[PDB]
Design an enzyme around this catalytic site. Structure first.
Site, short mmCIF file in Angstrom:
data_model
loop_
_atom_site.label_atom_id
_atom_site.label_comp_id
_atom_site.label_asym_id
_atom_site.label_seq_id
_atom_site.Cartn_x
_atom_site.Cartn_y
_atom_site.Cartn_z
N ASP A 1 26.83 33.03 25.46
CA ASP A 1 25.69 32.33 26.05
C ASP A 1 24.72 31.86 25.00
O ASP A 1 23.86 32.64 24.59
CB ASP A 1 25.00 33.30 27.03
CG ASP A 1 23.98 32.61 27.91
OD1 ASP A 1 23.46 31.56 27.50
OD2 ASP A 1 23.71 33.11 29.02
N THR A 2 24.84 30.61 24.55
CA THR A 2 23.98 30.13 23.48
C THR A 2 22.52 30.02 23.94
O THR A 2 21.64 29.94 23.09
CB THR A 2 24.43 28.77 22.93
OG1 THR A 2 24.53 27.84 24.01
CG2 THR A 2 25.80 28.86 22.28
N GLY A 3 22.31 29.98 25.26
CA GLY A 3 20.99 29.85 25.87
C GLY A 3 20.25 31.18 25.98
O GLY A 3 19.08 31.21 26.38
C1 LIG Z 1 22.09 34.24 33.60
C2 LIG Z 1 23.17 33.27 33.07
C3 LIG Z 1 24.48 33.53 33.86
C4 LIG Z 1 22.77 31.82 33.43
N1 LIG Z 1 21.52 31.32 32.86
C5 LIG Z 1 21.59 30.60 31.58
C6 LIG Z 1 21.00 31.34 30.38
O1 LIG Z 1 21.52 30.72 29.19
O2 LIG Z 1 21.45 32.69 30.38
C7 LIG Z 1 19.47 31.40 30.38
C8 LIG Z 1 18.81 30.05 29.98
C9 LIG Z 1 17.31 30.28 29.96
C10 LIG Z 1 16.60 30.37 28.77
C11 LIG Z 1 15.22 30.58 28.77
C12 LIG Z 1 14.55 30.72 29.99
C13 LIG Z 1 15.25 30.63 31.19
C14 LIG Z 1 16.65 30.41 31.19
N2 LIG Z 1 18.94 32.42 29.50
C15 LIG Z 1 18.59 33.68 29.85
O3 LIG Z 1 18.51 34.10 30.98
O4 LIG Z 1 18.33 34.41 28.71
C16 LIG Z 1 17.56 35.64 28.86
C17 LIG Z 1 18.17 36.69 27.91
O5 LIG Z 1 17.75 36.30 26.61
C18 LIG Z 1 16.43 35.74 26.69
O6 LIG Z 1 16.36 34.54 25.99
C19 LIG Z 1 16.32 33.45 26.93
C20 LIG Z 1 15.61 34.01 28.18
C21 LIG Z 1 16.17 35.46 28.22
S1 LIG Z 1 20.43 30.63 34.00
O7 LIG Z 1 19.36 30.01 33.21
O8 LIG Z 1 20.11 31.66 34.98
C22 LIG Z 1 21.32 29.31 34.83
C23 LIG Z 1 22.02 29.56 36.01
C24 LIG Z 1 22.71 28.52 36.64
C25 LIG Z 1 22.70 27.23 36.08
N3 LIG Z 1 23.38 26.20 36.69
C26 LIG Z 1 22.00 26.99 34.88
C27 LIG Z 1 21.31 28.03 34.27
#
Ligand SMILES: CC(C)CN(CC(O)(O)[C@H](Cc1ccccc1)NC(=O)O[C@H]1CO[C@H]2OCC[C@H]21)S(=O)(=O)c1ccc(N)cc1
Lengths: 99, 99
Positions: free
Chosen positions: B25-27
Protein backbone atom coordinates in the site's frame (compact mmCIF):
# COMPACT_ATOMS: atom_id res chain seq x y z
CA UNK A 1 9.63 7.85 -13.70
CA UNK A 2 10.74 5.58 -10.80
CA UNK A 3 9.30 6.82 -7.55
CA UNK A 4 11.03 5.77 -4.32
CA UNK A 5 8.90 5.64 -1.18
CA UNK A 6 10.93 7.50 1.36
CA UNK A 7 8.23 10.15 1.07
CA UNK A 8 4.55 10.14 0.08
CA UNK A 9 4.30 9.59 -3.72
CA UNK A 10 2.50 12.83 -4.51
CA UNK A 11 1.99 14.00 -8.08
CA UNK A 12 0.24 16.86 -9.84
CA UNK A 13 -3.07 16.00 -11.52
CA UNK A 14 -5.41 17.97 -13.79
CA UNK A 15 -9.09 17.30 -13.37
CA UNK A 16 -12.16 19.27 -14.44
CA UNK A 17 -9.86 22.14 -15.43
CA UNK A 18 -8.19 22.35 -12.04
CA UNK A 19 -4.66 21.42 -10.96
CA UNK A 20 -4.39 19.36 -7.79
CA UNK A 21 -1.90 17.33 -5.76
CA UNK A 22 -2.74 13.65 -5.33
CA UNK A 23 -1.32 10.48 -3.77
CA UNK A 24 -0.41 7.48 -5.98
CA UNK A 25 -2.04 4.74 -3.94
CA UNK A 26 -1.72 1.05 -4.73
CA UNK A 27 -3.92 0.19 -1.73
CA UNK A 28 -6.87 2.12 -3.16
CA UNK A 29 -9.23 0.24 -5.51
CA UNK A 30 -10.79 3.46 -6.78
CA UNK A 31 -9.89 7.11 -7.20
CA UNK A 32 -11.24 9.55 -4.64
CA UNK A 33 -11.02 13.32 -5.01
CA UNK A 34 -11.98 16.06 -2.52
CA UNK A 35 -15.26 17.97 -2.84
CA UNK A 36 -15.55 19.60 -6.26
CA UNK A 37 -17.98 20.14 -9.13
CA UNK A 38 -17.78 17.76 -12.04
CA UNK A 39 -20.10 17.58 -15.02
CA UNK A 40 -22.48 14.74 -15.62
CA UNK A 41 -24.70 12.38 -13.77
CA UNK A 42 -23.56 10.64 -10.62
CA UNK A 43 -24.66 7.98 -8.22
CA UNK A 44 -24.24 7.81 -4.47
CA UNK A 45 -21.92 5.25 -3.02
CA UNK A 46 -20.30 4.35 0.29
CA UNK A 47 -16.53 3.76 0.48
CA UNK A 48 -14.91 2.13 3.49
CA UNK A 49 -11.42 2.29 4.90
CA UNK A 50 -9.66 2.69 8.22
CA UNK A 51 -11.91 4.57 10.57
CA UNK A 52 -15.15 3.72 8.73
CA UNK A 53 -17.21 4.64 5.71
CA UNK A 54 -17.85 7.88 3.82
CA UNK A 55 -20.54 8.80 1.31
CA UNK A 56 -19.24 9.87 -2.08
CA UNK A 57 -20.62 10.80 -5.51
CA UNK A 58 -19.60 8.39 -8.26
CA UNK A 59 -18.81 10.02 -11.63
CA UNK A 60 -18.14 7.83 -14.64
CA UNK A 61 -15.85 8.38 -17.64
CA UNK A 62 -13.96 11.35 -16.35
CA UNK A 63 -10.71 12.40 -17.92
CA UNK A 64 -7.71 12.98 -15.67
CA UNK A 65 -4.14 13.89 -16.52
CA UNK A 66 -1.78 12.12 -14.10
CA UNK A 67 1.80 13.33 -14.18
CA UNK A 68 1.34 14.36 -17.80
CA UNK A 69 -0.54 11.16 -18.69
CA UNK A 70 -4.16 11.07 -19.90
CA UNK A 71 -6.36 8.42 -18.32
CA UNK A 72 -10.13 7.87 -18.22
CA UNK A 73 -12.23 6.20 -15.55
CA UNK A 74 -14.51 6.44 -12.58
CA UNK A 75 -13.86 9.14 -10.05
CA UNK A 76 -15.37 9.26 -6.59
CA UNK A 77 -15.95 12.75 -5.11
CA UNK A 78 -16.37 13.26 -1.41
CA UNK A 79 -15.01 14.34 1.95
CA UNK A 80 -11.61 12.64 1.68
CA UNK A 81 -8.70 14.14 3.65
CA UNK A 82 -6.35 13.67 0.67
CA UNK A 83 -6.78 13.20 -3.09
CA UNK A 84 -6.09 9.56 -3.97
CA UNK A 85 -5.30 8.03 -7.34
CA UNK A 86 -6.26 4.36 -7.03
CA UNK A 87 -5.73 1.25 -9.17
CA UNK A 88 -8.57 1.97 -11.66
CA UNK A 89 -6.47 4.80 -13.04
CA UNK A 90 -2.95 3.62 -12.12
CA UNK A 91 -3.34 0.71 -14.50
CA UNK A 92 -4.18 3.07 -17.36
CA UNK A 93 -0.89 4.85 -17.04
CA UNK A 94 1.00 1.56 -16.83
CA UNK A 95 2.12 1.93 -13.25
CA UNK A 96 3.76 -1.08 -11.61
CA UNK A 97 5.13 -1.95 -8.19
CA UNK A 98 8.65 -3.32 -8.37
CA UNK A 99 11.04 -4.86 -5.88
CA UNK B 1 9.16 -8.98 -8.97
CA UNK B 2 7.21 -6.46 -11.10
CA UNK B 3 3.59 -6.22 -9.99
CA UNK B 4 0.81 -4.74 -12.08
CA UNK B 5 -2.35 -3.32 -10.56
CA UNK B 6 -5.26 -4.90 -12.40
CA UNK B 7 -5.83 -6.86 -9.17
CA UNK B 8 -5.18 -5.88 -5.55
CA UNK B 9 -1.45 -6.27 -4.86
CA UNK B 10 -1.76 -8.95 -2.14
CA UNK B 11 1.27 -10.84 -0.85
CA UNK B 12 1.90 -13.43 1.81
CA UNK B 13 3.55 -12.22 4.96
CA UNK B 14 4.92 -14.17 7.89
CA UNK B 15 4.69 -12.49 11.24
CA UNK B 16 4.72 -14.12 14.66
CA UNK B 17 5.36 -17.42 12.94
CA UNK B 18 1.98 -17.13 11.20
CA UNK B 19 1.26 -16.76 7.50
CA UNK B 20 -1.09 -13.92 6.60
CA UNK B 21 -2.14 -11.98 3.49
CA UNK B 22 -1.42 -8.25 3.23
CA UNK B 23 -1.91 -5.38 0.79
CA UNK B 24 1.13 -3.53 -0.57
CA UNK B 25 0.00 0.00 0.00
CA UNK B 26 1.98 2.98 -1.23
CA UNK B 27 -0.75 5.26 0.19
CA UNK B 28 -0.04 4.09 3.77
CA UNK B 29 2.72 5.76 5.74
CA UNK B 30 2.71 2.94 8.30
CA UNK B 31 2.13 -0.82 8.42
CA UNK B 32 -1.04 -1.87 10.13
CA UNK B 33 -1.99 -5.45 10.98
CA UNK B 34 -5.22 -6.87 12.42
CA UNK B 35 -5.40 -7.79 16.11
CA UNK B 36 -2.87 -10.41 17.19
CA UNK B 37 -0.34 -10.92 19.97
CA UNK B 38 3.12 -9.52 19.52
CA UNK B 39 6.06 -9.51 21.96
CA UNK B 40 7.32 -6.55 23.96
CA UNK B 41 5.87 -3.30 25.20
CA UNK B 42 3.58 -1.22 23.03
CA UNK B 43 2.97 2.50 22.69
CA UNK B 44 -0.25 4.29 21.85
CA UNK B 45 -0.85 5.80 18.44
CA UNK B 46 -3.74 7.44 16.65
CA UNK B 47 -4.09 6.62 12.95
CA UNK B 48 -6.18 8.73 10.61
CA UNK B 49 -7.65 7.13 7.55
CA UNK B 50 -10.36 7.80 5.08
CA UNK B 51 -13.25 7.45 7.52
CA UNK B 52 -11.97 8.77 10.84
CA UNK B 53 -9.26 8.07 13.41
CA UNK B 54 -8.52 4.79 15.13
CA UNK B 55 -6.39 3.96 18.17
CA UNK B 56 -3.75 1.30 17.56
CA UNK B 57 -0.91 -0.39 19.48
CA UNK B 58 2.57 0.41 18.17
CA UNK B 59 5.23 -2.35 18.39
CA UNK B 60 8.82 -1.62 17.37
CA UNK B 61 11.56 -3.83 15.99
CA UNK B 62 9.25 -6.60 14.80
CA UNK B 63 10.59 -9.16 12.34
CA UNK B 64 8.24 -9.70 9.40
CA UNK B 65 8.86 -11.55 6.12
CA UNK B 66 7.17 -9.93 3.13
CA UNK B 67 6.73 -12.15 0.09
CA UNK B 68 10.00 -13.73 1.12
CA UNK B 69 11.85 -10.51 2.02
CA UNK B 70 12.92 -9.98 5.62
CA UNK B 71 12.19 -6.58 7.12
CA UNK B 72 12.46 -5.42 10.74
CA UNK B 73 10.54 -2.38 11.91
CA UNK B 74 7.45 -0.80 13.40
CA UNK B 75 4.08 -2.49 13.10
CA UNK B 76 0.74 -1.07 14.25
CA UNK B 77 -2.01 -3.39 15.44
CA UNK B 78 -5.68 -2.41 15.45
CA UNK B 79 -9.05 -2.71 13.72
CA UNK B 80 -7.98 -2.43 10.10
CA UNK B 81 -10.20 -4.08 7.47
CA UNK B 82 -7.12 -5.61 5.86
CA UNK B 83 -3.44 -6.13 6.69
CA UNK B 84 -1.57 -3.22 5.11
CA UNK B 85 2.14 -2.96 4.33
CA UNK B 86 2.98 0.73 4.24
CA UNK B 87 5.99 2.77 3.12
CA UNK B 88 7.97 2.20 6.32
CA UNK B 89 8.46 -1.46 5.30
CA UNK B 90 8.14 -1.07 1.51
CA UNK B 91 11.34 0.99 1.60
CA UNK B 92 13.12 -1.81 3.47
CA UNK B 93 12.36 -4.29 0.71
CA UNK B 94 13.42 -1.70 -1.87
CA UNK B 95 10.00 -1.28 -3.52
CA UNK B 96 9.41 1.44 -6.05
CA UNK B 97 6.53 2.73 -8.16
CA UNK B 98 7.29 3.00 -11.86
CA UNK B 99 5.49 4.32 -14.90
C1 LIG C 1 -7.54 0.84 4.01
C2 LIG C 1 -7.04 0.47 2.60
C3 LIG C 1 -7.62 -0.92 2.22
C4 LIG C 1 -7.66 1.45 1.57
N1 LIG C 1 -7.33 2.86 1.72
C5 LIG C 1 -6.17 3.37 0.97
C6 LIG C 1 -4.95 3.74 1.81
O1 LIG C 1 -3.82 3.80 0.93
O2 LIG C 1 -4.69 2.70 2.75
C7 LIG C 1 -5.12 5.02 2.62
C8 LIG C 1 -5.01 6.31 1.76
C9 LIG C 1 -5.14 7.49 2.71
C10 LIG C 1 -4.03 8.27 3.04
C11 LIG C 1 -4.17 9.35 3.92
C12 LIG C 1 -5.42 9.65 4.46
C13 LIG C 1 -6.53 8.87 4.12
C14 LIG C 1 -6.40 7.78 3.24
N2 LIG C 1 -4.16 5.14 3.70
C15 LIG C 1 -4.36 4.78 4.99
O3 LIG C 1 -5.41 4.44 5.48
O4 LIG C 1 -3.16 4.85 5.66
C16 LIG C 1 -3.20 4.89 7.12
C17 LIG C 1 -2.05 4.04 7.65
O5 LIG C 1 -0.87 4.82 7.43
C18 LIG C 1 -1.19 6.20 7.61
O6 LIG C 1 -0.70 6.96 6.56
C19 LIG C 1 -1.79 7.35 5.70
C20 LIG C 1 -3.01 7.47 6.63
C21 LIG C 1 -2.76 6.29 7.61
S1 LIG C 1 -8.68 3.92 1.75
O7 LIG C 1 -8.12 5.28 1.68
O8 LIG C 1 -9.52 3.53 2.87
C22 LIG C 1 -9.59 3.65 0.22
C23 LIG C 1 -10.63 2.72 0.18
C24 LIG C 1 -11.32 2.51 -1.01
C25 LIG C 1 -10.97 3.24 -2.17
N3 LIG C 1 -11.64 3.04 -3.34
C26 LIG C 1 -9.92 4.17 -2.11
C27 LIG C 1 -9.23 4.37 -0.92
Amino acid sequence: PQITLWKRPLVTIKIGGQLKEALLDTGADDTIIEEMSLPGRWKPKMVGGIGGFIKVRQYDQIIIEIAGHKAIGTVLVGPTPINIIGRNLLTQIGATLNF
